[PDB]
Design an enzyme around this catalytic site. Structure first.
Site, PDB file in Angstrom:
ATOM      1  N   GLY A   6       0.904  -1.528   0.367  1.00  0.00           N
ATOM      2  CA  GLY A   6       0.408  -0.103  -0.216  1.00  0.00           C
ATOM      3  C   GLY A   6       0.832   1.459  -0.191  1.00  0.00           C
ATOM      4  O   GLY A   6       1.992   1.602  -0.984  1.00  0.00           O
ATOM      5  N   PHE A   7       0.682   2.630   0.885  1.00  0.00           N
ATOM      6  CA  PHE A   7       1.407   3.489   0.696  1.00  0.00           C
ATOM      7  C   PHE A   7       2.906   3.260   1.512  1.00  0.00           C
ATOM      8  O   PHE A   7       2.929   3.190   3.376  1.00  0.00           O
ATOM      9  CB  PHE A   7       0.089   4.948   1.442  1.00  0.00           C
TER      10      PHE A   7
END
Ligand code: HEC
Ligand code: HEC
Ligand code: HEC
Ligand code: HEC
Ligand SMILES: [Ca+2]
Ligand SMILES: [Ca+2]
Lengths: 376, 355, 125, 376, 125, 353
Positions: free
Chosen positions: D68-69
């Site tokens: 993800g981020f």
């Protein structure tokens, strides 16, 4: 001549010399107008994607909207909202799937509705504009389902709720003509008219067959809801036109976008959004180039312009870039938008002279879809 | 002698003197006029066959003998899949091990034992000459030798071109002698891109030299009991047909309810369908697969009875990874697949396609 | 390199977009992200659905049916992208259509596109 | 001469010609070994990101993991598992935040644990390897939190559960030395030893200040957990070495990576992962180039190699590409890994002669972090 | 062009990485995605946290504190990417560090990075 | 004009403007203490005692330094009220403010304008000074006299002496000296943390005469000052509504908000806040951690070792600015203290010890 970055440097420098204060804040986009254009970036099938909102007159990005896997964008013709049908997963590209529709305010770009679509019912396909579609009143969104079988989902935008799936025949694409009626194109070479309600089998009526099984109708036809005009090229640049303005299908005379000599020398349409239609001018724009017959999704470097009534060629523009998709603004003196997937750049042309006026680059990873509002 | 062994099996194949009351030969149930399947009506229609006693019914549908000679001998492959063999449950290793079984089965040919079969063979001077020429003097005086020889001959005969001619339309089209119609071509395209190709093609990839539209594996597709057939067989309301797990020496409970994938050659003329003859129409056998994929209410319903398909006889070990494809066959695609499967009919059976 | 030129198959490098079996591939070649010509990379899920094409093999002069199957449940690999469309038909002839995400039947209902494999399933006709 | 794509065409043609069947299936990656290397792509801050698992010896991608981020990757030195701490949002980059840890089997790449971290506690920052760290026994993952204050989260991998946050002082990075102990670098120029039993406040002790305020220590030191050697370069190439192998910090003689004359001529380290350390060889590798003092994050075209004991220079290589990050395999005759963010390409070099052997391109959008296991 | 050369500021174009106010920006200039030099694009969330730098303005010869604030809650814009590091210090000097996502204080707890604005917030010293 | 201010200079230290002649403006706004009140009453230095020797206010006496830089009360185009005088902005400007303490019974306690005028008229110097500037007979008209005294006091407050701009901070911005390392760190924290969202004049750009306030109104969620509320005699049922108490403000969202103070001289003008609730500058800074920090100690007022206490007015809290997501550690509280000390005017630097 002065660029937008240059004009801004000059204004900032004058505010600093004048001692002018201003509060850092979140901007609103300018009011939607005829020269607003949206570019969607499916990003070569990435799990997350982006839409760029652009002022075509200035050639400036005025906003962005994030999306998930292969979202379908729609833009209300009157400028009042935009929306998409989108898909996310609980762990990037794996885990629980959620399909949903968002509606956004066209100036703040905030979501005004987030409507869950039950049982993951979206068709995951490289993006076809007419696989998700608004009814002319803007109250209903219609989306295509492929799996387990062709079906159409009905979403009430006004009440912000998913309504029902409709069973349909072996048919594709969704061209709404009324608050409760749309058309589809069938494997059998007919159109089906689907008239639906809140419950009950929809009434489904086929038109006559209008094309042989070996003329291939492209995945990106142009459709003007306000004209009721369905403009559908084949792989050879033969163009079918169907008038649905009466609420029933009327088959118009077919026209040839290329001449017989051009065809003999290998001219064919090719790209993604290969055709545009300008309603007020009743004009058709087709992306074409010299190419082998099975290179039908490659970029094209020319656009032919022809009168929809007579099929007479009005212009052939040399675009000067590798163009995948075209569209036009629906105002007078329209703009011709020419999007390059490979350059990730929208080129903005004068639709009358074909001359490149300006361009907007850095539009994501593989931008393909151009949408405009017909506000006239 | 290759020819001669087969010729001996040709004679045995049509000889009723291998049945207890002499009413029944191989060809009685495996009728050459019906792609080697049983045209005779019994208490369960054509679902199951009647034995030499005129009363006993089996519990399984009589399969074609066409193309059975292409099936490998029974074995477990590298990825632990059982493959090959003969009978719907693979309980026979090969054609030769299979042949002796109907002969001694009291529900079929009902001969009491090997010595009784040897005594029938020894009564016919043509068999004394033919058997001794291939297997040696006195063969028919030794019940075990005689029985093994007869089975060998029968297996040789089913290996001849007569049982596996590869002269269907499909074969002609594959040689470039003719072309599929658009419907048949669509049916072919469907068959090879949908889940059918995962079990009804010889190979996982590449091209087979002599395709017979089965991978010779064992799968449970979750079919119900055929009530009238099961009532006719007399095995009881509480009987379960365990498929492959009934093969002696298979103990793995995961094998329960799996049956050998049949060859689809001649499928159009060999109804009714499946291991217990449960469906009359080829269309219905194809529609059965939509029970795993379709959301429509009509997919839960057997169109021959208007009632639900029924609870699987064995509700465990179903091949759900392959069956739950996520796609429903619409009627145009069922039509196409019927058309395509009809091109798998051998040339001599083409006249039967009208019926 | 001329993108509009007639596509010309080769049978000497499977990671190149002119490799003969990739004649109607759309996406990414699985061999470039840890799969192989006909296997999925670890972590991904092999679909059962496919789209087909008849692709000429310049090694043996035969045309073979390639049933493309996707490896699914991962973001797009980004390595060896290719888009070829030999015989490729519009979406209303889906068995020949390659914009569709052919992930149906993947384990765990995986529907995201990672890469495509190119196995032969039959002879062309 | 023959590439992997060519050898694969030849084997596939032979299988076809020979009639060899094989069942299409999901591959397993080869067993983890010393030459396996991982490359993480933070994708220039994109909401989703990728890790590439590479066989360094063949120069072949053997698998990938989605994140993800700004995820933090870790790799167990013994080859038994890999894991990351990652961050997702309910609508791409907006809505409810979930931080979590995943553990993966290192040949199937399947997640074997998904452990939610309460209250979104991760530090979202350009990726620093030592902001998330495994204890030597591999039973605990430690992650850094910056908001509301410096803290460290303890995650039980054996029990698959988050345990608690440790309150620390104004300190950064996490270098584990035992099942219950790690060291951080504090703003005041010391290191802090943090000891934690399962209950209570941790026990926290500081070293002496070991650098001045005006000497800037990079975001990416090299740490060998098996050696307990912390190699920390400053903006000028001054190299700090701290020995932690006794459970306490002992400061080794400071060493200079560049000469007084090279510095005079503008030679400075620059990049992302600027330093590598080889345990068995006791050798330091540093990315360097001629550059202005505030171009410290730009690519460098050269590597210097020097003895960690003596500090003498053993080699200077011309890398021949714009290199942002380096690392080395921990076996004998090691590889030197040279990752270019701009080229999105891992260049794979002989660590002794410095010659380029092979490379792996198309590694995402802006790849930045190389990780290897120390298996010997 | 020469990335290792001393950075040279200009006061003529706010979309180029050499604009004087961008002397320690890391990310994307918000002016290229529908914000302006000191404002956030629609749909995004303005943080109240910042990292700061003293940026020399070639026009008036003065040094200004630029306190960079992030626009948050969107995926990164991908337009006009820039990384400069004038006076940039390591993470342990966070007020001066620029790898950090300075989204703290943003409405709706937005923490994803979209772009950065470059407002002047005082004189240097 | 020089004259006008010279007159106001006289008025400012004259007790003849209180009922019993015990206090002048300078009593509560002591030029020796940056124009605030040194005197200890029933609630310490939290609130001031009026002319009657008994009555206490409910609000802390603020500095008059720099108050001449505040714009007249107005509502800006973003709908934020700005400027004015008093913690609640109830006076438009310095002129409107000056007359109010004179007539306040808990302060100087003059009964009416006419009594003020009578006192001005008894002084020969005031007859001369006032008549020279405003015209002969001015002191005989109570309304003219009172308005003229208010003008002169406003004029006096607008001289160089109340707003000298000679603090260390000012010398450093002129490039005359440098901050210490600690000072410079505190300055960096100040302009990068949430402080600068309320305590700097402009949103961006550089101000010509910075006073470390934006002139806006905010409720930061402060508790009642218990002993001060008791001393004021306003009763325990009283609630200080801040700007909402200004006549003509009707908007419920202004309840509990107070004018952002200038931080010039903050180091020498404790105790802090509108109610003097905190005696120490470090406690004022630490109060902001209550909105950001997780640590058990962030809930606790260090001066008491007890929880801060609920806000006097629980609505309209400036949560967007206050809930910054970051806690100030001790080293950052230390640096802010150091920076704020540099906002002390030159003549008050000896007070810093
Ligand atoms: C009374 C009817 C009947 C007679 C007579 C009969 N069979 Fe069959 N045959 C069947 C049935 C029923 C099955 C399926 C039984 C099962 O699977 O348990 C079968 C199965 C077979 C199979 C297996 C084919 C496959 O695909 O699995 C072969 C081979 C076979 N028979 C050959 C023979 C030969 C040779 C004879 C004569 C010696 C013969 N049969 C006599 C009814 C008969
Ligand atoms: C999972 C493996 C598998 C899949 C997938 C599969 N089949 Fe079958 N098929 C079987 C097995 C096993 C049987 C026999 C089942 C039984 O009788 O117990 C069978 C029986 C049949 C029959 C009856 C043949 C006979 O002689 O009785 C037809 C027709 C058939 N399948 C067609 C299809 C078609 C068309 C598809 C694709 C829609 C398909 N099958 C998919 C394994 C499969
Ligand atoms: C009994 C003590 C006392 C006396 C005497 C006094 N004040 Fe004050 N002053 C205060 C208090 C208390 C406040 C705050 C009251 C409030 O905000 O409601 C204040 C507020 C002010 C303010 C507003 C400053 C700001 O930042 O909001 C000005 C201006 C002021 N006084 C000027 C004067 C002048 C001029 C005199 C003499 C005419 C004077 N004061 C007499 C206690 C006093
Ligand atoms: C939301 C706007 C806002 C923010 C952010 C803010 N302040 Fe304040 N500050 C105020 C207001 C309003 C007051 C007066 C509150 C009251 O008395 O009701 C105040 C009062 C003060 C005082 C007391 C001054 C006096 O004369 O009594 C100090 C010291 C102070 N603030 C420092 C800071 C510091 C340091 C920060 C950053 C850590 C900060 N403030 C953040 C608005 C703010
Ligand atoms: Ca049958
Ligand atoms: Ca005070």
């Amino acid at each position: 001549q002065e660029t937008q970055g240059q004009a801004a440097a000059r204004a900032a420098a004058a505010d600093l010399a004048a001692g002018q204060d201003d509060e850092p804040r979140i901007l609103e986009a300018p009011a939607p107008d005829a020269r607003r254009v949206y570019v969607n970036d499916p990003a070569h099938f990435a799990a997350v994607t982006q839409q760029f909102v652009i002022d075509g007159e200035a050639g400036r990005v005025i906003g962005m909207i994030d999306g998930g896997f292969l979202p379908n964008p729609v833009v209300a013709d009157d400028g009042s909202f935009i929306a998409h049908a989108s898909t996310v997963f609980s762990r990037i590209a794996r885990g629980e799937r959620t399909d949903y529709v968002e509606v956004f305010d066209p100036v703040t770009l905030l979501p005004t509705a987030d409507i869950e679509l039950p049982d993951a019912p979206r068709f995951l396909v490289g993006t076809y504009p007419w696989m998700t579609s608004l009814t002319p009143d803007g109250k209903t969104l219609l989306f295509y389902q492929f799996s387990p079988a062709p079906a159409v989902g009905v979403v009430d935008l006004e009440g912000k709720a998913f309504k029902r799936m409709l069973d349909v025949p072996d048919c594709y694409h969704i061209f709404p003509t009324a608050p409760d009626t749309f058309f589809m194109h069938c494997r059998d070479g007919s159109l089906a008219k689907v008239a639906f309600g809140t419950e009950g089998t929809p009434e489904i009526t086929h038109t006559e067959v209008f094309h042989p099984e070996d003329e291939f109708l492209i995945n990106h036809p142009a459709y003007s809801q306000k004209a009721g005009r369905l403009v559908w090229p084949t792989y050879t640049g033969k163009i079918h036109q169907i008038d649905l303005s009466s609420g029933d299908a009327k088959f118009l005379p077919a026209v040839e976008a290329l001449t017989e000599a051009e065809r003999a020398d290998g001219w064919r349409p090719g790209g993604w959004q290969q055709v545009a239609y300008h309603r007020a001018l009743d004009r058709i724009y087709l992306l074409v180039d010299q190419r082998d017959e099975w290179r039908h999704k490659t970029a094209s470097r020319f656009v032919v312009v022809l009168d929809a009534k007579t099929g007479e060629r009005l212009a052939k523009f040399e675009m000067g870039h590798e163009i995948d998709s075209i569209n036009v603004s629906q105002d007078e003196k329209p703009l011709l938008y020419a999007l390059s997937t490979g350059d990730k750049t929208l080129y903005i042309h004068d639709a009358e002279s074909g001359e490149e006026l300006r361009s907007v680059n850095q539009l994501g990873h593989g931008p393909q879809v151009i949408t405009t509002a017909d506000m006239g | 002698a290759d020819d001669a062994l087969a010729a001996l099996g040709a004679q045995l194949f049509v000889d009723p003197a291998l049945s207890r009351n002499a009413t029944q030969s191989c060809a009685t149930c495996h009728d050459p006029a019906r792609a080697f399947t049983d045209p005779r009506e019994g208490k369960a229609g054509l679902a199951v066959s009647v034995g030499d006693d005129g009363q006993s019914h089996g519990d399984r549908n009589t399969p074609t003998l066409g193309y059975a000679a292409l099936v490998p001998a029974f074995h477990r492959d590298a990825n632990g899949k059982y493959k090959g063999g003969q009978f719907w449950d693979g309980r026979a290793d090969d054609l030769k091990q299979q042949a002796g079984q109907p002969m001694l089965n009291p529900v079929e040919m009902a001969m009491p034992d090997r010595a009784a079969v040897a005594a029938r063979l020894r009564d016919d001077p043509a068999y004394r000459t033919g058997f001794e020429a291939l297997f040696g003097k006195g063969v028919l005086d030794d019940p075990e030798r005689a029985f093994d020889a007869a089975a060998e001959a029968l297996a040789a005969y089913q290996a001849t071109g007569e049982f596996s001619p590869f002269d269907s339309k499909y074969d002609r089209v594959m040689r470039g002698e003719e072309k599929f119609t658009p419907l048949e071509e669509f049916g072919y395209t469907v068959f090879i891109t949908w889940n059918c190709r995962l079990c009804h093609m010889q190979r996982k990839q590449g091209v087979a030299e002599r395709e017979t539209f089965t991978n010779f594996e064992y799968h449970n597709i979750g079919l119900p009991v055929n009530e009238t057939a099961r009532e006719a067989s007399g095995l009881g309301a509480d009987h379960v047909d365990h498929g492959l797990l009934a093969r002696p020496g298979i103990e793995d409970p995961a094998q329960s309810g799996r049956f050998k994938v049949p060859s689809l050659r001649n499928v159009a003329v060999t109804g009714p369908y499946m291991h217990n003859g449960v469906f009359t129409d080829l269309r219905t056998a194809i529609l059965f697969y939509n029970k795993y994929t379709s959301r429509r209410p009509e997919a839960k319903i057997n169109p021959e009875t208007g009632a639900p398909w029924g609870e699987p006889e064995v509700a465990r070990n179903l091949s759900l990874a392959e069956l739950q494809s996520g796609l429903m066959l619409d009627d145009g695609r069922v039509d196409a697949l019927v058309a395509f499967l009809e091109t798998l009919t051998d040339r001599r059976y083409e006249p039967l396609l009208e019926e | 390199t001329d993108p509009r030129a007639k596509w010309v198959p080769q049978d000497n490098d499977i990671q190149a977009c002119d490799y003969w079996r990739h004649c109607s591939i759309d996406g990414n070649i699985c061999d470039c992200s840890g799969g192989s010509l006909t296997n999925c990379p670890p972590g991904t899920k092999l679909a059962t659905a496919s789209w087909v094409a008849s692709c000429y093999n310049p090694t043996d002069g035969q045309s073979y049916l390639i049933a493309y199957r996707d490896c699914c449940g991962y973001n797009v690999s980004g390595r060896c992208p290719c888009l070829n469309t030999e015989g490729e038909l519009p979406v209303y002839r889906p068995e020949f259509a390659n914009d569709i995400i052919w992930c149906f039947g993947a384990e765990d209902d995986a529907m995201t596109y990672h890469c495509t494999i190119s196995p032969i399933v039959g002879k062309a006709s």
